[PDB]
Design an enzyme around this catalytic site. Structure first.
Site, short mmCIF file in Angstrom:
data_model
loop_
_atom_site.label_atom_id
_atom_site.label_comp_id
_atom_site.label_asym_id
_atom_site.label_seq_id
_atom_site.Cartn_x
_atom_site.Cartn_y
_atom_site.Cartn_z
N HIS A 1 -12.23 3.93 -2.49
CA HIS A 1 -10.78 4.07 -2.35
C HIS A 1 -10.07 4.58 -3.61
O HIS A 1 -8.84 4.63 -3.63
CB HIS A 1 -10.14 2.75 -1.91
CG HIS A 1 -10.58 2.27 -0.56
ND1 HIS A 1 -9.91 2.62 0.59
CD2 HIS A 1 -11.59 1.46 -0.19
CE1 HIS A 1 -10.51 2.05 1.63
NE2 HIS A 1 -11.53 1.34 1.18
N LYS B 1 6.08 2.50 -2.59
CA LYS B 1 4.66 2.35 -2.87
C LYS B 1 4.57 1.54 -4.16
O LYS B 1 5.57 1.40 -4.87
CB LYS B 1 3.97 3.71 -3.06
CG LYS B 1 4.66 4.64 -4.08
CD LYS B 1 4.09 6.06 -4.03
CE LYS B 1 4.48 6.77 -2.74
NZ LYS B 1 3.26 7.29 -2.04
N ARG B 2 3.39 1.02 -4.47
CA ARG B 2 3.20 0.29 -5.72
C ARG B 2 3.59 1.16 -6.92
O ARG B 2 3.42 2.38 -6.90
CB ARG B 2 1.76 -0.21 -5.85
CG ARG B 2 1.41 -1.34 -4.87
CD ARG B 2 2.16 -2.63 -5.19
NE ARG B 2 1.77 -3.19 -6.48
CZ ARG B 2 0.94 -4.23 -6.65
NH1 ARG B 2 0.42 -4.85 -5.60
NH2 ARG B 2 0.65 -4.65 -7.88
N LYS C 1 1.31 7.68 -9.48
CA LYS C 1 2.20 7.93 -8.34
C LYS C 1 3.49 8.63 -8.78
O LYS C 1 4.25 9.14 -7.95
CB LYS C 1 2.48 6.62 -7.59
CG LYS C 1 1.26 6.07 -6.84
CD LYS C 1 1.46 4.63 -6.39
CE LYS C 1 0.24 4.05 -5.68
NZ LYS C 1 -0.01 4.72 -4.35
N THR D 1 -1.30 6.40 2.68
CA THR D 1 -1.09 6.10 4.10
C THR D 1 0.39 5.98 4.39
O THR D 1 0.82 6.19 5.52
CB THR D 1 -1.80 4.80 4.54
OG1 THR D 1 -1.46 3.75 3.63
CG2 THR D 1 -3.32 4.98 4.57
N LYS E 1 2.95 7.26 7.70
CA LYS E 1 4.00 6.45 8.32
C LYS E 1 5.33 7.21 8.39
O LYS E 1 5.99 7.21 9.44
CB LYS E 1 4.18 5.12 7.58
CG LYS E 1 2.90 4.30 7.38
CD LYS E 1 3.14 3.09 6.48
CE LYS E 1 1.83 2.41 6.07
NZ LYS E 1 2.06 1.35 5.05
O1 LIG Z 1 -8.20 0.83 -4.98
C1 LIG Z 1 -7.29 0.21 -4.44
N1 LIG Z 1 -6.97 -1.07 -4.65
C2 LIG Z 1 -7.55 -1.95 -5.49
C3 LIG Z 1 -8.43 -1.56 -6.50
C4 LIG Z 1 -8.99 -2.53 -7.34
C5 LIG Z 1 -8.69 -3.88 -7.17
C6 LIG Z 1 -7.81 -4.27 -6.16
C7 LIG Z 1 -7.24 -3.30 -5.32
C8 LIG Z 1 -6.44 0.96 -3.42
O2 LIG Z 1 -5.52 0.35 -2.86
N2 LIG Z 1 -6.71 2.23 -3.17
C9 LIG Z 1 -5.89 2.96 -2.18
O3 LIG Z 1 -6.61 2.93 -0.94
C10 LIG Z 1 -5.81 3.50 0.13
C11 LIG Z 1 -6.57 3.28 1.45
O4 LIG Z 1 -7.76 4.07 1.45
C12 LIG Z 1 -5.53 4.99 -0.16
O5 LIG Z 1 -4.68 5.50 0.86
C13 LIG Z 1 -4.87 5.17 -1.54
O6 LIG Z 1 -4.82 6.56 -1.87
C14 LIG Z 1 -5.64 4.41 -2.63
O7 LIG Z 1 -4.94 4.41 -3.88
#
Ligand SMILES: O=C(Nc1ccccc1)C(=O)N[C@@H]1O[C@H](CO)[C@@H](O)[C@H](O)[C@H]1O
Ligand SMILES: O=C(Nc1ccccc1)C(=O)N[C@@H]1O[C@H](CO)[C@@H](O)[C@H](O)[C@H]1O
Length: 813
Positions: free
Chosen positions: A354, A545-546, A551, A653, A657
């Site tokens: 991810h 978004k976060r 970002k 994502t 939306k």
């Molecule tokens: O890596 C992520 N989170 C994370 C990473 C490390 C520890 C805790 C949470 C994460 O949220 N990645 C996001 O995943 C989404 C679903 O696939 C993507 O749409 C985003 O682009 C991505 O940043």
């Protein structure tokens, strides 16, 4: 009221009303004279939940009888949001409950606002898991979500003096009507101890035990009578834990230490913190889950059929310990030979990545694993040795490849690369958008792709059209249903039929009317709950978004200030009025992200109170952005800001939306934006800025921010305003860190996209001046949003990774 919300039959409404009164009396122990709004919410939740039980029991007995291949989705995060409306939608109960409550003198929407979000995730990764569960149930898959029941979810964000404050999300305070505790299925999880090599095999001994107690939550499919299970583990001390009066009392109090494992969600989005408690959480979910899986498999000795009956999907590397844990159980407990156990493990496990940000990748210090999980470390070493022997055979003499591909990273402290472990131990590795998956094969996992190209796949992300259209935007769902029927809700590709309505004057009017209503409703929400005033006729410009540098909320900030400076320079010149809304949480220890939030509020403070500006520009920070707030703001948006530096947002994502809900997108060619533009047509997307190739070229050359500062006078003014204290008169150097970062250590090249961004934003304003053409382009977006249904995504996982066929067939009611 509206068709897509189901029937309000005489029989159903009468029965709902009587069951509501029964629960109020027998379940809540109240009468109508003392009952509070919260009591009414709970009575309704119990009334609806009763409708799940029969379907839930029969779904699970169906799986027992048919014995299909089971899908286990392991995640440390499930960002579920609220459950009441979703349950009604999926059961076709919404209009009936609305009627029943109305006849009882209650407003159902008011009752819905009482429910706490299940905020057991940080953002995108957690919400993806939630959408996925919905799609798996809707597609009739024998699927189980497995995670942790955090006592405290993602913190509630309060803004104080423009600064983020965190408070505990005590989401269980009033109880959770949607879960069923299963204390009889409690399982032991082992920590620490030591490894003893006997005559026949290794033994893990002298361990400390924590109990894992499961709580089950139903996951209803869309009107197919399927109810799947999300099982979340809670940590419990064994009764002899730590067992003088001071001694006795302390031993009982110390049970807290064991129970702390499931206490709180780590609030990091896209960052790795190597804390022991986090490692404990990761093993805890893995160990308890794998025992549950094996138990269920045996109740069908011969593990050759294990991969035929079990799929385990790893949501990033967080549950990567599933790989050595499965090996441990198969080798140490079941007495399988290594090679057979390995074959079973690889064929069972698949891994989804991810993120490509290096700081986010999990690299666990060897000394932590040595102490906490001594047997797992030994197994990881053995996996590494056998894996590297394979690499050496395939690429003889390539010594650097060996060190690059090793699961063990050497350095100051030795670390285990969990991503390398996952690739080695999985039959499938996927990214989450076409560009991201290509980046995986070309850059960070290039060595692995060269060794095993067949392993690497793409599965472009999606969102559930149930929560993200029907639930949050019933008005839009209805005007679509009026033209093309209801079937699109579980077959979103049918939205393409809307292309034949792009010149339909009635539809254009209806689409525009639905948006205006949503904007009015949201403008009323802002006044009621926050006392802030906004112009509902203005362009709603939203970035939610976060908060993270990649970002580029800062690029948005630069545009906002540009607009303000332009207005101030030529006050009596017409500009398209905008409401710029930015929202999102910052990780508590991410200083820069917290500074960015303060900057946003500081800009708002200046802009929102300048009399010359008037109602032409408003800047609002949306506090406590979360799933329930997303359901409110997204239907109200005109413009979706998706402006990450090319190559940094794996998919996104939130982008999908907004597209589904009638906003146009301003964005870089990053993540799933590429595919969105491809689906809608580039003419129907506001694309700007560097592509991945352009970023690469700049990196080779070296990124010099000064160059942009020197050549762009409008950008120079902003930086000078920031540095001088224009936005912080009492603390003139407040934003010095932001300026320094932008000028000297900007990994994300904010300045490089500034000119194109501002230019593109002018083209947005121009189009918004032509409401008819704006709406026509919107229709072209909604119409081509079908690909981004998580039903499509899950169907692809099912056929290409899990080896199971989805089904839209109903179970009997
Ligand atoms: O890596 C992520 N989170 C994370 C990473 C490390 C520890 C805790 C949470 C994460 O949220 N990645 C996001 O995943 C989404 C679903 O696939 C993507 O749409 C985003 O682009 C991505 O940043
Ligand atoms: O039925 C329950 N939850 C549920 C039922 C259906 C769908 C979703 C959640 C549930 O939580 N029941 C509780 O069981 C306890 C004993 O295990 C009882 O003491 C509680 O009164 C009951 O609420």
């Amino acid at each position: 009221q509206i068709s897509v919300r189901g029937l309000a039959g005489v029989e159903n409404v009468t029965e709902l009303k009587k069951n509501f009164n029964r629960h109020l009396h027998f379940t809540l122990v109240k009468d109508r004279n003392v009952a509070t709004p919260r009591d009414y919410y709970f009575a309704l939740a119990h009334t609806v939940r009763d409708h799940l039980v029969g379907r839930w029991i029969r779904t699970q007995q169906h799986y027992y009888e048919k014995d299909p291949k089971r899908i286990y989705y392991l995640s440390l995060e499930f960002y579920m949001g609220r459950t009441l409306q979703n349950t009604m939608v999926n059961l076709a109960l919404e209009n009936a409950c609305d009627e029943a409550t109305y006849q009882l003198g209650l407003d159902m929407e008011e009752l819905e606002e009482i429910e706490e979000d299940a905020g057991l995730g940080n953002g995108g990764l957690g919400r993806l898991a939630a959408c996925f569960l919905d799609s798996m149930a809707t597609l009739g898959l024998a699927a189980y979500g497995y995670g942790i029941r955090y006592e405290f979810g993602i913190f509630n964000q309060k803004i104080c003096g423009g600064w983020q404050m965190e408070e505990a999300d005590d989401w269980l305070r009033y109880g959770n009507p949607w879960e069923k505790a299963r204390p009889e299925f409690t399982l032991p999880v082992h920590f620490y101890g030591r490894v003893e090599h006997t005559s026949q095999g290794a033994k893990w001994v002298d361990t400390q035990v924590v109990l894992a107690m499961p709580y089950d939550t139903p996951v209803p499919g869309y009107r197919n009578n399927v109810v799947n299970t999300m099982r979340l583990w809670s940590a419990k001390a064994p009764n002899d834990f730590n067992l003088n009066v001071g001694g006795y009392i302390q031993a009982v109090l110390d049970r807290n230490l064991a129970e702390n494992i499931s206490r709180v969600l780590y609030p990091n989005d896209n960052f790795f913190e190597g804390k022991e408690l986090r490692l404990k959480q990761e093993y805890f979910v893995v160990a308890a889950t794998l025992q549950d899986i094996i138990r269920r498999f045996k109740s069908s000795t011969n593990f050759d059929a294990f991969p035929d009956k079990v799929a385990i999907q790893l949501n990033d590397t967080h549950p990567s310990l599933a790989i050595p844990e499965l090996m441990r159980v198969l080798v140490d407990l079941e007495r399988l030979d290594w090679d057979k156990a390995w074959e079973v493990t690889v064929k069972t496990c698949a891994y989804t990545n991810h993120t490509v940000l290096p700081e986010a990748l999990e690299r666990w210090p060897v000394h932590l694993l040595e102490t906490l999980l001594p047997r797992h470390l030994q197994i990881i070493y053995e996996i590494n040795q056998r894996f590297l022997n394979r690499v050496a055979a395939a690429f003889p003499g390539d010594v650097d490849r060996l060190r690059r591909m090793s699961l063990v990273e050497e350095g100051a402290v030795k670390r285990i690369n969990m991503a390398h472990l996952c690739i080695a131990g999985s039959h499938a590795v996927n990214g989450v958008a076409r560009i991201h998956s290509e980046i995986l094969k070309k850059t960070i996992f290039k060595d692995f792709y060269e060794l095993e190209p067949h392993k690497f796949q793409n599965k472009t992300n999606g969102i559930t059209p149930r929560r993200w259209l029907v639930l949050c935007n019933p008005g839009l769902a209805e005007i679509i249903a009026e033209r093309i029927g209801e079937e699109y809700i579980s077959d979103l590709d049918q939205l393409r039929k809307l292309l034949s309505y792009v010149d339909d004057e009635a539809f254009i009017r209806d689409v525009a009317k639905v948006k205006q209503e949503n904007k009015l409703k949201f403008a009323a929400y802002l006044e009621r709950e926050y006392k802030v005033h906004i112009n509902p006729n203005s362009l709603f410009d939203v970035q939610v978004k976060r908060i993270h540098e990649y970002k580029r909320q800062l690029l948005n900030c630069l545009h906002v200030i540009t607009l303000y400076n332009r207005i101030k320079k030529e006050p009596n010149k017409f500009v398209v009025p905008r409401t710029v809304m930015i929202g999102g949480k910052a990780a508590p220890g991410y200083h820069m992200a917290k500074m960015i939030i303060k900057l946003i509020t500081a800009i708002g403070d200046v802009v929102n109170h300048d009399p010359v500006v008037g109602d032409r520009l408003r800047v609002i920070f949306l506090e406590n952005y979360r799933v329930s707030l997303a359901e409110k703001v997204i239907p109200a948006a005109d413009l979706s800001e998706q402006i990450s530096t090319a190559g940094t947002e794996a998919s996104g994502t939130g982008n999908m939306k907004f597209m589904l809900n009638g906003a146009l997108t301003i964005g870089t060619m990053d993540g799933a934006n590429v595919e969105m533009a491809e689906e809608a047509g580039e003419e129907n997307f506001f694309i700007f800025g560097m592509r991945v190739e352009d970023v690469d070229r700049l990196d080779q050359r070296g990124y010099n921010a000064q160059e942009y500062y020197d050549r762009i006078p409008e950008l120079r003014q902003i930086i000078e305003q920031l540095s001088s204290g224009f936005f912080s008169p009492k603390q003139p150097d407040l934003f010095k860190d932001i300026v320094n970062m932008l000028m000297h250590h900007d990994r994300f090249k904010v300045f490089a996209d500034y000119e194109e961004y501002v230019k593109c934003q002018e083209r947005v304003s121009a189009l918004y001046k032509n409401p008819r053409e704006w709406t026509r382009m919107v229709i072209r977006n909604i119409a081509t949003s079908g690909k981004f249904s998580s039903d499509r995504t899950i169907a692809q996982y099912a056929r290409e990774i899990w080896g199971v066929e989805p089904s839209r067939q109903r179970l009997p009611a």
